[PDB]
Amino acid sequence: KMEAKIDELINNDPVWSSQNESLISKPYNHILLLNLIVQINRVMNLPKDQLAIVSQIVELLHNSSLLIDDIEDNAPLRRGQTTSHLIFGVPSTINTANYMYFRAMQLVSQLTTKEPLYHNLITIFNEELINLHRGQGLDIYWRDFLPEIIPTQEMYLNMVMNKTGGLFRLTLRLMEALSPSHSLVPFINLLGIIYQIRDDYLNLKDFQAEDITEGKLSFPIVHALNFTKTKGQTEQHNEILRILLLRTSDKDIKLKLIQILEFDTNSLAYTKNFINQLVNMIK
Amino acid sequence: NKMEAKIDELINNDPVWSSQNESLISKPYNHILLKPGKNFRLNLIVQINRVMNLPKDQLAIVSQIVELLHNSSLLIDDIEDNAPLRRGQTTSHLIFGVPSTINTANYMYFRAMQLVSQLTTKEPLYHNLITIFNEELINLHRGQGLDIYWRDFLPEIIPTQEMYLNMVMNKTGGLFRLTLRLMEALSPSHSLVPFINLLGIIYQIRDDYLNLKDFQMSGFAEDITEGKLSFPIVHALNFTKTKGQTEQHNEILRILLLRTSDKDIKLKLIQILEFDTNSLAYTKNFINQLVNMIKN
Numbered sequence: 402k403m404e405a406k407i408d409e410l411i412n413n414d415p416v417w418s419s420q421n422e423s424l425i426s427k428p429y430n431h432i433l434l435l436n437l438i439v440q441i442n443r444v445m446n447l448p449k450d451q452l453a454i455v456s457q458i459v460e461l462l463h464n465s466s467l468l469i470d471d472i473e474d475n476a477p478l479r480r481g482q483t484t485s486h487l488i489f490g491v492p493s494t495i496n497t498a499n500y501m502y503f504r505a506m507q508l509v510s511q512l513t514t515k516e517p518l519y520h521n522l523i524t525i526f527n528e529e530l531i532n533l534h535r536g537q538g539l540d541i542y543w544r545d546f547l548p549e550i551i552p553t554q555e556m557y558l559n560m561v562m563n564k565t566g567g568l569f570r571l572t573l574r575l576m577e578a579l580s581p582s583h584s585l586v587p588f589i590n591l592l593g594i595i596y597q598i599r600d601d602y603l604n605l606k607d608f609q610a611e612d613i614t615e616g617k618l619s620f621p622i623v624h625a626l627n628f629t630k631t632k633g634q635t636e637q638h639n640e641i642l643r644i645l646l647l648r649t650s651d652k653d654i655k656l657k658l659i660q661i662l663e664f665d666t667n668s669l670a671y672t673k674n675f676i677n678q679l680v681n682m683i684k
Numbered sequence: 685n686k687m688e689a690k691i692d693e694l695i696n697n698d699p700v701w702s703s704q705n706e707s708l709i710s711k712p713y714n715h716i717l718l719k720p721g722k723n724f725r726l727n728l729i730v731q732i733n734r735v736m737n738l739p740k741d742q743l744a745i746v747s748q749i750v751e752l753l754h755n756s757s758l759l760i761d762d763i764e765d766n767a768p769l770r771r772g773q774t775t776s777h778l779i780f781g782v783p784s785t786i787n788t789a790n791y792m793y794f795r796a797m798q799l800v801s802q803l804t805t806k807e808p809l810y811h812n813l814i815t816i817f818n819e820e821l822i823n824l825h826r827g828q829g830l831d832i833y834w835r836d837f838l839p840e841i842i843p844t845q846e847m848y849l850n851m852v853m854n855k856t857g858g859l860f861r862l863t864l865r866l867m868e869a870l871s872p873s874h875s876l877v878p879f880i881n882l883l884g885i886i887y888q889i890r891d892d893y894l895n896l897k898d899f900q901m902s903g904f905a906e907d908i909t910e911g912k913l914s915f916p917i918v919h920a921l922n923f924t925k926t927k928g929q930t931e932q933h934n935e936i937l938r939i940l941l942l943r944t945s946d947k948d949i950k951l952k953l954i955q956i957l958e959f960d961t962n963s964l965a966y967t968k969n970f971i972n973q974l975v976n977m978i979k980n
């Protein structure tokens with residue numbers, strides 16, 4: 402009888418239920434608690450149904466990438482709410498995030514069955530996910546190996562072209578390949594750089610600032626470090642490095658670094674200016 | 685304008701990635717490569733090839749893909765299981781940190797995916813190979829998802845033997861089937877899926893079993909420390925509940941939830957499976973029976 406039961410088991414597809422699906426989706430639904438795509442669809446005109454799938458794909462990749470990003474950055478909050486890994490644990494959250502990457506991958510074959518186009522859609526998805534990981538890997542490396550390597554502005558920019566530019570290009574490239582109708586890739590790349598630098602800027606600017614606790618080589622920090630190095634302001638250079646290495650939650654210490662950035666290096670205004678220029682390129 | 689020029693060149697080009705960059709983020713992965721065991725996984729592919737007859741060329745790429753997926757899944761598994769050691773060596777995440785290890789492992793899943801397109805230039809076939817790849821990685825994550833949920837939310841769910849077996853069909857069967865199905869799909873030459881599923885089940889129950897048996901004889905019985913609903917444990921929990929051994933049932937749950945490294949506590953739990961629930965003999969026997977299904 403044992404053999405009978407085993408025989409039936411190995412000759413069938415693996416058993417997966419609706420209820421199993423729900424257990425596994427808990428970390429993902431918790432982060433659940435588009436107009437950019439619509440707007441762009443005015444140039445691409447994908448039929449509405451197709452656009453729904455592309456959109457579903459983008460939401461999966463995007464949400465899964467944040468679930469893992471929060472474990473990677475040891476983030477306690479996301480949009481004011483407790484992060485999924487603190488509620489469901491790191492194990493379930495990694496696994497669920499990764500599962501949705503592959504679920505997102507499956508939705509791609511439902512965008513088209515035309516064999517030439519399908520290969521292209523998979524190559525786009527694969528290439529940009531590879532880029533998201535390269536950029537994320539460099540961002541993480543710099544932070545965790547600090548002070549081994551202090552990136553320059555140019556190195557930061559290439560990291561961003563991958564870490565943030567990847568999913569922006571993934572959405573845009575899929576729509577341009579599926580479009581019935583110049584590439585807007587350069588534009589979406591620029592959008593990605595502005596979005597990231599503004600993310601870094603705002604994180605400090607609104608502190609009145611988790612990036613400090615995280616110890617990330619943000620755009621303002623990269624400017625401050627290279628400015629102090631260039632001016633041979635040894636003590637200020639080292640004090641910035643010392644605070645980031647503290648992985649501190651102390652607001653008084655966070656404010657202290659913000660002041661080095663405000664008063665010694667003027668990195669905030671410098672970053673403010675940089676963003677305004679990127680934005681002007683478009684205007 | 686010099687800035688706008690530089691910005692213009694940046695956004696009108698592919699992103700810049702260097703081999704130095706590539707090396708720097710491959711650290712967690714390169715570390716697990718030192719662990720031995722490759723030859724055997726290769727032997728499996730070779731033996732299977734005697735039936736499939738893939739040219740050596742293609743078989744080589746099938747193997748690179750399987751190795752990348754296997755090592756990447758073990759990097760993540762050790763983070764998930766809080767494992768200190770893998771093949772007598774310190775785990776990548778304890779050395780390079782969880783963030784780099786997760787990112788690197790996931791990066792390697794996408795590099796493996798990329799290799800699939802080196803298996804053929806024919807669009808129909810390519811589409812089936814990518815679907816197999818996609819389906820079985822979805823299966824790997826479904827299985828891991830349950831093993832991990834049962835363990836971390838214990839005692840919310842006490843799996844039965846049947847549930848354990850369905851989770852293993854996904855958790856381990858997934859990569860066994862991935863390898864075989866890519867090969868069957870590539871073969872110029874009945875499906876071996878049922879066989880490879882049995883192989884995976886024997887593989888997993890034996891891994892669960894040896895983990896306790898080696899410690900009871902000499903191993904670390906790290907599955908007790910991890911809290912894993914192993915095959916022996918699932919049997920003991922269901923046996924105790926059925927036989928009315930309330931205290932034993934509860935003590936088994938309590939020891940799993942301590943996440944303990946104390947050797948005597950681990951040995952007390954193993955001797956409970958030995959003498960009180962007889963879960964060890966039951967497992968040895970269950971294994972032997974599955975092995976006879978093949979030998980006979």
Ligand SMILES: O=P(O)(O)C(O)(Cn1ccnc1)P(=O)(O)O
Pocket residue numbers: 470474537564565600
């Ligand atoms: O600062 P990060 O790069 O981690 C972030 O922008 C996420 N992210 C990840 C990749 N690109 C951006 P978030 O501030 O949302 O935590």
Ligand SMILES: O=P(O)(O)C(O)(Cn1ccnc1)P(=O)(O)O
Pocket residue numbers: 761765828855856891
């Ligand atoms: O016990 P696990 O399932 O975690 C294991 O077998 C790995 N694994 C992961 C998925 N299937 C098997 P290992 O004992 O090598 O840690």
Ligand SMILES: [Mg+2]
Pocket residue numbers: 470471474476
């Ligand atoms: Mg973050």
Ligand SMILES: [Mg+2]
Pocket residue numbers: 470473474540
């Ligand atoms: Mg991050």
Ligand SMILES: [Mg+2]
Pocket residue numbers: 761762765767
């Ligand atoms: Mg493990």
Ligand SMILES: [Mg+2]
Pocket residue numbers: 761764765831
């Ligand atoms: Mg495991």
